[PDB]
Amino acid sequence: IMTDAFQTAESREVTGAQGFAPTEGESIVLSHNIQHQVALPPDLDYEYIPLSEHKPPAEPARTYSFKLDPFQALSVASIEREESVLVSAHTSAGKTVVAEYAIAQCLKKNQRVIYTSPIKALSNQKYRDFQAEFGDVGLMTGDVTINPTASCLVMTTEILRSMLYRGSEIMREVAWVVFDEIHYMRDKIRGVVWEETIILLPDKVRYVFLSATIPNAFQFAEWIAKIHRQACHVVYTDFRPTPLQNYFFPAGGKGILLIVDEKGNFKENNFNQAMAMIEEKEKADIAKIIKMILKKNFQPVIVFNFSKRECEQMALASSSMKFNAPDEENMVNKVFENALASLSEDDKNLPQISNILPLLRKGIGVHHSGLLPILKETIEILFQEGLIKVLFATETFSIGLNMPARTVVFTQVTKWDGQQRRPLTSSEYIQMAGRAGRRGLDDRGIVIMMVDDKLEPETARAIVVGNQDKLNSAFHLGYNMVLNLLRIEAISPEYMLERCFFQFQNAASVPQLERELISLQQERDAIIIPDESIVKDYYGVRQQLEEYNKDMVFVIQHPQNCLGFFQEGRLIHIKSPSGVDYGWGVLIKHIQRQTPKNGQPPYPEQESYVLDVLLKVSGDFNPKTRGEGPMPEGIMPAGKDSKNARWEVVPCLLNCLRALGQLRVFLPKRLESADEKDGVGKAVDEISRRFPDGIPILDPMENMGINDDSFKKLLRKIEVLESRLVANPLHNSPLLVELWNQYSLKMQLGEQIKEKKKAIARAHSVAQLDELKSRKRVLRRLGFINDAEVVQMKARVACEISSTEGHELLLAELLFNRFFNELSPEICACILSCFIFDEKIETQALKEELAKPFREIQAQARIIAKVSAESKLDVNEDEYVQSLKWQLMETVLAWAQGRPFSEICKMTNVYEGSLIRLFRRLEELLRQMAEAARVMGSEELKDKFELSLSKIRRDIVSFNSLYL
RNA sequence: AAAA
Ligand SMILES: Nc1ncnc2c1ncn2[C@@H]1O[C@H](COP(=O)(O)OP(=O)(O)O)[C@@H](O)[C@H]1O
């Protein structure tokens, strides 16, 4: 805190006037900043550098009667003057309106446009919006291509790439190409696709970039400006319509703590006190939140969860409550009957729908990819119409069209599998929490996050409190990619690596990254600590002893040692694992808890036993039914010592035992009333009067008879480490607090410096380059290309495989080797099912009919993985083999034989929505392999893939829109 | 294992 300001907290009005000309501070505060910057095209010669200003007027010449705010004005104005523009703002900013102008601008003078979306499901929704608006619109997806000759086109990012590599003529006729949610280029699988598309695109194409808030937004335009020789504008705004307050919910905790104030203030104590809660360690705790926020009037509330599976469970436990009124009760199934006419009688009885119908009546929504496109769309409608006050959604919901709420809850702070157990990045936080805070009902937005972690916390602060993260290119080499680049003569695989956004980052980052280090080095040098050395050897050995004594009590707490010393009435010292002391006590009874009901994994023997122990603590009096946590929820005698002081038998876990007494107190059989328990307390108090310095402890060595070589070692390193603490200015003054507080930042920055040091190592990283030589060797060895590394016939059908990434070689190998021709069309379709999707499926079929072809295409993977691994790449022999799924082979095959859709989902646990997804994509692998056989010269396998394709196509499995 |  140096120079900063503070908004008016709750409600205020700053101005007033009378009768002629006022000054408007009216009903908005405080959302302020906007930004406009322009990237410029590089100059060819020294001889001439033109300096070209363009500052476009606020309100354009013709607004087409459309409604526009000051922000979207210059976004439109940039397109109006016909130049590329980047709009980076929250999904609340209304970015869609500028996309409709760009198309309308082109349609006005009658030329062609391409609209694109990260996701095909969202592409279809925007299509029917565009078609019903303009009418000259048509969509090309993989599955369905409708009206391709239309001026405006809605297509998958996958399709847009496939036409460029194949050099479609339609790209010569396209003026503008609109990319939406481009900040999702981060995706480790399909994010590389966005870069491949952009770089290869014609230089005369004008661009529109619709993105969330990103720090490097200007850096992105530089990269577009340099490779395309264009002037690319940047329109960026940080404003959001509603203030945001952040509450932390500790795991197992009984409440929420406010970490971030509405004005941005970060509470350190709430953060620290929250961490005290998590040392006390399937949580139903979400059912509690949704319960009270109904009564606290926080609605609607969007609960974000990153798994399809556990997402429905948190909806199930909350299904025991009903938040809807009778007028809302019958309104949801009155609007539910419209989609029945759009469905078949067999499909209207579908199992998924019969579950959700009573659920929506209770006012509980659910949104994810495992849902039917018609069913999830009604749920999307019902939310923004206000008939659903509680929604359990996945990350995809935050990517889609604006559908804001009053509350946003983060259930999990860790993120996905692909390369890392990855803490939640800042960009995802801004995007999801941006859903909170609608216009006129919210004084404030409410954001709740549950926090537990798997190594060390300092990260946990950095997510919300710290800075944002760079938008990192996920660009990486691929088999399908290197062949497509080696395919066209005009371009080499090295050409794309040059213009890839990852290279553009590193080149411009490193000279600046050098200044990042020297500025960091000044601060740690600018801090001057008296006796800079001795302290490093105090804090150094401070964390050394505090850590190694934890290893001593841990062995003692283990039943191997302490258990034999458990006797009724033995004096016991109880201190919670968090470090809070419940005071002394006396052992009443010890019992091992055996065989819990089901859910939680069986107990480790450290926490296994349960010790009933008499303590003088107080707090919420009841909890005799005791949570599996360490203790009933109490409060030690810091609290009300008047309202309660009672010696009470407390069922403490075994890890709460830090010491044992030397002698035991005689105990009766029953402590029930206050009399029976208070009498034992005086028996304890008597011991305290005779032992002022402390109560004698059983010596772990001699008294408890622990001779272990590992125990002796730890205990010997305990003694000598204690002696080092006395050799420092520990005694005769405790000023170490001021030293540690100043020295703490020195180590934080020092650790922060080492990262910036290793940051340069990753800027100069050769991973892309070294992979290419190693990857092109297996292309030569497997026979895909020659010794001169020139394309061969096999590589021409491998460039035709798109929809499937990673089996591109396997599929190319099997097809060229004359495999699918020895089979039947139904068999050909069920075999290609293994490649299409990686979601787990449970059914039991080892049936030898489909096991024979599966084992063969599986063995071929081992052949591929054999030479590819010793080529100095990294792939395991087992991992790649198992990347194909046999659990769905029975399922898809049944649909091809003309069995009803309803029975199909009864064979497996596959989502009815996910089943649609893997079919439509399987459908496209067929259409792509139809072209693959067409290049090979074998036209019998073309019809083979076409006759198979015809059996996956029917009336009700094709449902999007029917217009023109 | 989330998203296409
Ligand atoms: N000038 C404006 N100020 C505030 N809200 C607006 C404005 N224009 C549109 N909106 C509303 O804000 C929401 C965001 O619009 P939209 O463009 O659909 O979101 P996205 O940017 O995700 O496409 C819309 O529901 C719209 O009604």
What does this entry look like structurally?
By secondary structure, the chain is an alpha/beta fold. It has 4 domains: 34-237, P-loop containing nucleotide triphosphate hydrolases (Rossmann fold); 244-464, 3-Layer(aba) Sandwich (Rossmann fold); 568-698, Elongation Factor Tu (Ef-tu), domain 3 (Beta Barrel), CATH 2.40.30; 792-949, Sec63 N-terminal domain-like fold (Orthogonal Bundle). It is 40% helix and 13% strand. It has 36 helices and 22 strands. The strands form 4 sheets. Strands 1-8-2-7-6-3-5-4 form an 8-stranded mixed beta sheet. The chain has a 7-stranded mixed beta sheet with strand order 10-9-17-14-11-13-12, with helices on both faces. It has a 5-stranded antiparallel beta sheet with strand order 21-20-19-18-22. Strand 6, helix 5 and strand 7 form a beta-alpha-beta unit. The longest helix has 28 residues, at 736-763. The chain is globular, with a radius of gyration of 33 Å. The two termini are 61 Å apart. The structure holds adenosine-5'-diphosphate. Adenosine-5'-diphosphate binds at residues 69, 91-97, 401-402. Residues 69, 91-97, 401-402 line the site of adenosine-5'-diphosphate. The structure holds one RNA strand of 4 nucleotides.
* Main sheet attributes: strand count, strand direction, barrel closure: 8 strands, mixed
CATH names the topology of the largest domain as Rossmann fold
CATH architectural designation of the largest domain: 3-Layer(aba) Sandwich
Overall CATH class of the largest domain: Alpha Beta
Bound molecules: adenosine-5'-diphosphate
Strand order of the largest sheet: 1-8-2-7-6-3-5-4
Please state roughly what percent of the residues sit in beta strands, choosing from under 5%, 5-15%, 15-25%, 25-35%, 35-45% or over 45%: 5-15%
Q: How helical, in percent, are the residues? A: 40-55%
Q: How many structural domains can be distinguished in the coordinates? A: 4
Structural class: alpha/beta
Helix count, per DSSP? 36
Subcellular location: Nucleus
Pfam family, one: DEAD
Family: Belongs to the helicase family. SKI2 subfamily.
Domain Helicase C-terminal: 285-489
